[PDB]
Design a protein around this ligand. Structure first.
Ligand code: FE2
Ligand code: FE2
Lengths: 136, 133
């Protein structure tokens, strides 16, 4: 996975559990613990996290800000694909594939588009109309 | 670049020039010629193309056309929703081969949604002005 993938998962585990165990990270990302330990070393050098003797891995403010951004980006992209009518089963893998390869410009414009549909259900109905007309 | 990247570029070159030289592919993909020859052999095995130079099989032609369509569609998508033009190409290159066909087709419907009534485009721009502040 990418550095972004590791920070995203670490932030989520701290939110869910209160801590991020190397074993939990390894299971979440489907990687070997050694891959995790190496990435953690990298994230420590770049000051996204530190390692305490008693608490284990702890995000710095830099890590927390990035993690929160990454979770937001994930959730937004799922909401986007869901609103435009992608089969739910496909959404997660599509988001995992694209999320870390989009500019903030694109993310923010996708945010505006999500707001566009959420603000008036009639727009959703019209889009549903179009889909039927592109079905033939 | 992936297999999809190689076929997409090979198809474009045949459409542009009438042929696909290894050197043109290597230049388009910012890779060494040897990487190209390796992929070409893989593509020849999978029956996407043959060498007689490089010629796409019907399988390769169908895939290449799908890939250019997907590219062009995703650029139009980002453009319609107001992404800065200078960002669109790199964003598409990054996402294009990681989307299901379901997502591509739904994005296609969304593009048609906006292109059919210019007022929808105006309303989206209105929201961007709200979400700005
Ligand atoms: Fe994610
Ligand atoms: Fe492309």
């Amino acid at each position: 996975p990418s550095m972004e993938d590791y920070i995203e998962q670490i932030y989520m585990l701290i939110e869910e559990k209160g801590y991020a165990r190397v074993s939990d990270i390894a299971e979440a990302l489907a990687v070997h613990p050694s891959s995790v330990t190496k990435m953690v070393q990298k994230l420590d050098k770049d000051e996204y996290l530190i390692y305490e003797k008693y608490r284990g891995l702890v995000l710095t403010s830099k890590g927390k800000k990035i993690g929160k951004r990454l979770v937001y980006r994930h959730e937004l992209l799922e909401q986007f694909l869901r609103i435009i009518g992608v089969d739910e089963e496909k959404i997660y893998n599509d988001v995992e594939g694209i999320e870390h390869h989009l500019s903030w410009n694109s993310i923010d414009r996708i945010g505006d588009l999500v707001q566009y549909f959420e603000e008036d259900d009639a727009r959703k109905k019209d889009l549903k109309s179009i889909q039927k007309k592109t079905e033939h």
